[model samples]
Target: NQIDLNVTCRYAGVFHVEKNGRYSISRTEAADLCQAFNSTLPTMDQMKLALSKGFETCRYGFIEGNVVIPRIHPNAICAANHTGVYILVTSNTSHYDTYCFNASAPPEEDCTSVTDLPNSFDGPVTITIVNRDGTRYSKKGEYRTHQEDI
Candidate 1:
């Protein structure tokens, strides 16, 4: 009905992306990991924005220009009793989590519509052969969008 975002697209803004539940990610791996999430490594400013929004984590994460681990609630570990963005030296190569920035979907208005799923889906079994007129058929399964074309 209304314009919405793709599933993964909803992961907008800086995110503490992990390999499910693992750490010790490298600089090279940081970029790769973010890319896998359809995002990129968050810059320091972006990290700050996230932090401003109360985004603090105990795990050390790699930002774009520097390695940082935000600590809003400093205890003994995690940032050495400090309450701010802690920068790390040699930490670039060190293992840590990563902060990724998931860019939201470009303005949908720019692109009137998204390309339809097309004639066929991936699974071996065809989704169906329902015709445009509600009649059963074969590859007529070609799904069409409301718009004439892109």
Candidate 2:
């Protein structure tokens, strides 16, 4: 038996976050989401900015699917059913921006060239930071992933 491989082309997902409390991802958010895929995490100042706007800090990992909380880490092992990009965020810094991948797709190729705008994200992933009084502060916003120097 022989299998045909017709040079497949996948529709890349554009990622981003939204500034408004109620809206979709913005151009800047899209850029930032792609940046996180390549080994970049959002800055604390950026997180603060989102909080000021009354939005939560969001962590969007690029993977293939339309799911919310697919798993603790869906990209950890690429199975046949769940293959492609995935993103996860931990409340604490220890596990923040720790991207996992399954075996279904190829590994990292480069450091630059993030996907385009109209960013895609799934689930209701939220980031909760703690306060000195042992209370918690929560905010929701797309992960800041863009070129600050540009």
Candidate 3:
């Protein structure tokens, strides 16, 4: 496997929190979740520190006072193409990821793997033959079939 030296997270100890990659964690819930991870919700300073260390995510995260998306370099699609912490007020029903500060933990590679099927059926081994006409003259397979023509 190859790697990119200029990886986004140059430094560690802080990261955006998410549950299985799904966002929508409420603001109030954000603080609690971090503690459950043996960490705490990051403050603006923490967020800034992460950004200075080359940690940037287009996704917004909940901090002490607001929802913010930190960017090291401008991404037109993220934060309207600006750099730094893009901030927004947290609404009553707002849900967003939160940053957790775990001075003891590195910004580990977060991942979720996809489970493959138990086995491959190699079915639908169906085959079709076409003639001068736009219609399939022969088609046989394990499943049924349908056709329409002019």
For each candidate, how many residue pairs have backbone atoms clashing (under 3 Å)? 0, 23, 0
- lDDT score of residue 16 within candidate 1: 67
Per-residue lDDT of 58-143 in model 1, one digit per residue for the tens?
A: 76777888888876787787778877777876533466677777666332112122223232322332223222234332222211
Instruction: Return the lDDT, model 1, position 138.
Output: 29
Whole-model Cα lDDT of every candidate shown, in order: 0.52, 0.28, 0.54
Give one digit per residue, the lDDT tens place, for model 3 in 1-150: 111001122235666645324565666556654554456667788778777777788777777877888888998999789798888654455666677676655554322221111111223433332221223322222111212100
- Pick the winner on lDDT between candidates 2 and 3: 3
Query: Model 3's lDDT to the true fold?
Result: 0.54
lDDT tens digits by residue: candidate 2, 43-96: 333322322333222343222222112222234343213322223333232211
Best lDDT among the predictions, by candidate number: 3
Better of 2 and 3 by TM-score: 3
Who is ahead in lDDT, 1 or 3?
A: 3
Candidate 1: clashing pairs of residues: none
Off by over 4 Å in 3: 1-12, 89-93, 106-150
Cand. 2 TM to true fold: 0.19
